[PDB]
Design a binder for this molecule. Structure first.
Ligand SMILES: [Ca+2]
Ligand SMILES: [Ca+2]
Ligand SMILES: [Ca+2]
Ligand SMILES: [Ca+2]
Ligand SMILES: [Ca+2]
Ligand SMILES: [Ca+2]
Ligand SMILES: [Ca+2]
Lengths: 268, 268, 268, 268, 268, 268, 268
């Protein structure tokens, strides 16, 4: 019936030189039997940390119910802290805070070693809201081989994300050639047009679920994303539902994201 | 519990020089008491006529159910024939077929004369699919004083509508200046930028519900419409749901349109 | 299961020198058998007429449902037109428009002659919203012998009502002595303190149901009314519920009003 | 809501030189409004007549329920008598009984003249059981332009049908060259291989629903039919469900046939 | 009430010279009381292993629900790994990998020794999908004394299975006479024609449940199988349902298989 | 959803020299369409007449519900008066009151002429309670060609029935040979042993449903009947349920009788 | 809430000189609190042992459900093994196997000492099927002081049981007279005619529930038993329901037996 949440566990990060927090939801029956589970990485927005999806997202109640009713197969849900020290998901421009490196090289392997996780891309999905929606989006565009399904909710765009990366970096140490390089790596149109074919094929292979409310200040950004993806022949699910930039919207979408990635995990 | 549909009645049109067909749904209990009802005009797509919303849209079953369940207040639904002689909702460029004039100067007054109708704009809404979605959209942008609520479904755009008008007109008799004027009258950007303030204010006052499936070949057109409307401060409901350019989508949306306009008719 | 509404019938009023509109709801099965029914008079607000409770209040659907479910006993509901010529329920100060006289001396006797009505005060109730809530309130304070139950919803007070009467009157024909007399007749404090015992006893005998939303601009007025009635030992039901000055509130309260007066009509 | 059945009406047949019986189901509300309906022709098996689908098939109860529940859109159901004089659906070899000619040249036009029928192939379907399943199958292969959807239930094959045509004919008048001609016209393999592309395209365009119980003595025949159709690239729905050659099976399949053809009539 | 799954246990195989994986479902309450259970052996398709029916088949959720609802009696479900080293269920022709020997001589005795199993054929069933459907089919035809119930889902035929056996064998070491011997043992018609009466009676005694979707590329194979079994007087349940070669089909069929074999386990 | 009952109609009997009463239930929708219905003859017990199954049996409510719910197909139910003048179903020994002759030669033809009845034995059933259970039983044993289904409820035996016939006859005119002849005609053992093969075969073909409460004083009689029928290879349904000789029992069994005969009427 | 079953426990029998098997169902919540429970002894048929009611009867699921739903009060269910060494419930005629002595002198006291059992006859019931129905019947006729309620299901008679005893006894050592004496002890008529008043009163005091399917080859035996009991004024519940000599019948009757004996255990 009931899964459980741990909020206080940390990962020893060599890349960030500190203990990094995360929250984790383990499904009901994790403690019986010996099997392993697929994983959904679930990213918070600006101003929250790893407790955001727990306290505001109510992940425990919502995941318990979805799994118990059969709307979702059992899965582990990992909620990283991208708030402490610096807020955001990507490597800072001054080289002092390689958060994206930490996520892929330390957090994911730590989860797969510490919990009974099916450690394959076909069993790995990522979702997030606002800042975390852009995090999910560009994580998958940068490393499409690492995910089978991606669900950006009310996602911020690349220009906002890049602007936030600059405002947290010491730009005295950043060359102008470097600013231009990342700028392109944080631009959807550039990634889709200039990536090698192998990378583009994998991006098309990913199952995308993009959802944003019609009253959200990001509704135009996400409509432009829909159009850009179709222009580049990246099939995806797109939803514009009634709602705003609010936790009412994100709690409504969480069981939909769970059903979406679960069907991909189990096949159909 | 059951309304009824008349498919075979006609209006004598002086503007078009002929009897013109329409279908009409009368709600349950229209035949008892003496009261009047608000009206939803419901427009078909290319290749269908006034029987399209009856046979494919299943308006009778769907409207009966929504009203009986209290999801919609009772209303009359009028489905014009915009297929016979020429296909489309607008005045042809050669002056020989003024369908939009017919709709406003003859069809609406005929309905209000023949049936127990609340003959005010606050009780008049319009909706349609595909070609009829473009019909509903531009009818309201042309005559916003005539409608309180507008629901374009999977709507075609102005350029397609204008091109389809051209292929039905005698262009040997059409001046080059005439093409340029009507092109602007069928372009949303031009209407929103060049209309007098009284018309723009009324366009902003109208309650808009714009819905299109994410797999529709028109999904990009309707995302651009959402963006243009917000760019001009025209608030509206926007929905992009799962679905394609199909009667599954349009039958799904019909009770949503009925709930939407009913709430405006009854106030809330 | 379904009652019916007539909107187009009139009373020939000698007092107002014209045919006066009303709407009337007749319960299901009024047309079978020969029996008679109690009556709820249901008053509209400023700017609406006798169609307001029909189109916005959805009286037919709401009354049909309440009676069919047994939440209310069958009753006739009469909705007068207090909008045409002058807006409001009371005699104008210049003597040219004695609407209150019309209501009691012409409308009520016309209803009781024309329909199968139990024509006794124990079977007569009155309710209304906003301007009509003040109408119901002061109709009952003026003629407490005529009603068994009174339900002012989101009601305006006496000072607002009197100001309205003045702005529609030719005050060149009004003495200041008359202004003083009518203002006192439109002040609840004055009525309760200067009424004879027989009249005050009848006011206390009436069953009052006073309801107003907490977000309504009239919430303070109605809280003050609650305190004044208790201060004068006039027992009553008082409700302050979530809601505003809206048809959502008044449609929510209509079946509560029907249940309230029905229990009084049937005894319990 | 209840439709109704007429069992005693006839069509004057010049081709057969007699009054010919049929039963017809008219949907609920056929008597209200003026609209027209699509038609399902529903054929009986050997030994029954036009009353078989009424009394054993319980068409009235089953169709009423399917339509009232929204599982099927409203439709007219016509059940011909192919039992009186000679049993079977096809022209006898001695030229004395051209039943197939009667069905297409007299029965269908009579129905479309007498009832409010949408008289187009897109609104015409045919289904039947046992002998009538072979009837539906070969009517559609002979005249594929006449049907949009075909549903043979527990259908006999061509060899059985042709053998019965032989046993009902006076072969003293039949040449051997004619027997070979009809034999090919009643063989699915010959029709699919020898039809011109225009006819074959229409056969492939038809929506087929072929269903047979796994305990039916005809299960092998219908499995071979499935294999033959796929080998000629005729897409179709095939169902082999638990059950035998019984009215339990056919009453179970009737609402499935209704939903199947209804979806085609309304589009989706 | 939740059962549990162990995925990581193994049986030490002398025949295969290695530890061999399997997954096992134990029903709710296996850990209370001391009783024993019947067993369903459940085989995966090509490219999956013992985790396929766990992760994609969702065996734990589906079995929990079927048993808790009383659709199935409690049973143990064993999912062998027929993927590691070599893919497939049968003894390779070069003598290097006797998987079928392993299954009957080592896996089944290990299960009956290790778990509380009713170790009799009346309590032993086998089912599988695709490659595993052919495995279940020919396992029972080779050793019909070992099973009371057999359920091939979307099963490959003997020619496909034998061809896969050749492609995994070192054919440089295989005699042409041996190639002929195995081929006859992997062809359904030969077994039914060449088995002694004792063996054929047991094949007829087994309760067979054969199910395949009508859109599966194996639908023709399975229709031919249905016809072959009836030609040999082997009664069986045959289902051709809507569906494709997909996990939607196999998850739909799993509770049906459980109910089918459970009724045989419990008698009725 | 509503059938109706006529209690006051009569059939003019030449055989009995009087107008004879019956009650008849006509199913819902009898008055729409033109079709015909099967018939259940339903016989009362001692001391009641043709109103017994109406007032005590509540035939209208019970039949309406069974038919509306689909537990029974629509049917006509005929309830004869076998109480007026003499009580009982059989020809009196003195030749003065040939009630059985009346039932078969006058009542059945009158019903088939007067109502829209399918006038064949396959559409004719008979049931009854107590005295009428013996009536149904021996009517069918005497004339098995007239019924397809027979349902004796709490039935009296032949010895009781014969004794009642004697006590109502003037035995002064009856020979001892005549008493012996009728005794044998009213003895189930004699009927089953001595009826010709054709009669006995038809008795075995009839579908029998025999039901009696375990607390009924007739429970022994009906257990002996079950045993006698099996001894003579007359297959039948037998029910001994909790209950007594009461209208609670017969109202419980009426919808079971309707479902039993309905399945026979419609086939399955 | 689930009870549990032990299948592997044994009673140390000095009478039979060996460990004797039984199964036992303990109700949900047996492990909470310290109270005691009534007991139903539940006997298997010929060829099964103490696992029959567990595996085929599904006693755990059925008892769990009946108790959880409040259809039965909690009770312990004991299922003896009457199959090992010799099949049957009674003392063999050669004196070498006194199974009835074992049941009463060893099994019942063992159950009452080992489990929390209300060890009084008012809390002791017995039921069984086929051979075990005859076991329950004659156990109670032999020792009526030991049971408050007895439920023979599809019961064999005394002549069959006695014949079963002879075919297992060493007839070379068995005298003709002892053969006659036990024959009378296994004949219902003899027991009922020759028992003293004290014993007959207790047999009449027992609450009997006798049930058998109408298609069972033992239906005649049980109808004769019903008649014999009534002939001797032994009131009892008798049921003849649709069904055969099958586990469908016995699983259907098990919760009815539980409800029946539970009401007697709890009083009403
Ligand atoms: Ca919105
Ligand atoms: Ca989509
Ligand atoms: Ca509030
Ligand atoms: Ca079958
Ligand atoms: Ca299909
Ligand atoms: Ca009883
Ligand atoms: Ca039976």
């Amino acid at each position: 019936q009931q899964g459980k949440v741990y909020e206080t566990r940390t990962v020893k990060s060599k890349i960030l030189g500190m203990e990094r927090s995360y929250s984790i939801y383990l499904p009901a029956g994790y403690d019986e039997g010996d099997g392993s589970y697929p994983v959904l990485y679930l990213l918070h927005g600006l101003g929250d940390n790893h407790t955001g999806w727990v306290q505001f997202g109510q992940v425990q109640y919502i995941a318990d119910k979805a799994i118990a009713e059969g709307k979702s197969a059992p899965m582990i849900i990992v909620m990283p802290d991208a708030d402490t020290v610096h807020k955001g998901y990507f490597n800072l421009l001054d080289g002092t805070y390689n958060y994206e490196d930490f996520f892929f090289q330390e957090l994911i392997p730590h989860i797969e070693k510490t919990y009974r996780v099916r450690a394959e891309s076909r069993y790995r999905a990522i979702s997030g809201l606002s800042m975390g929606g852009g995090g999910a989006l560009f994580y998958a565009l940068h490393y499409p081989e690492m995910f089978v399904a991606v669900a950006p909710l009310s996602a911020v765009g690349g220009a906002w994300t890049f602007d936030q990366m600059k405002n947290q970096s010491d730009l005295s140490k950043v060359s102008e050639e470097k600013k231009a390089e990342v700028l392109g790596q944080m631009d959807i149109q550039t990634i889709l047009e200039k990536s090698p074919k192998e990378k583009l094929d994998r991006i098309k292979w990913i199952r995308w679920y993009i959802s944003c409310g019609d009253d959200d200040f990001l509704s135009v950004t996400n409509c432009l994303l829909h159009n850009t993806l179709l222009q580049h022949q990246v099939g995806h699910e797109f939803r514009m539902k009634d709602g705003s930039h609010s936790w009412t919207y994100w709690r409504m979408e969480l069981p939909e994201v769970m059903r979406f990635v679960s069907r991909i995990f189990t096949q159909y």
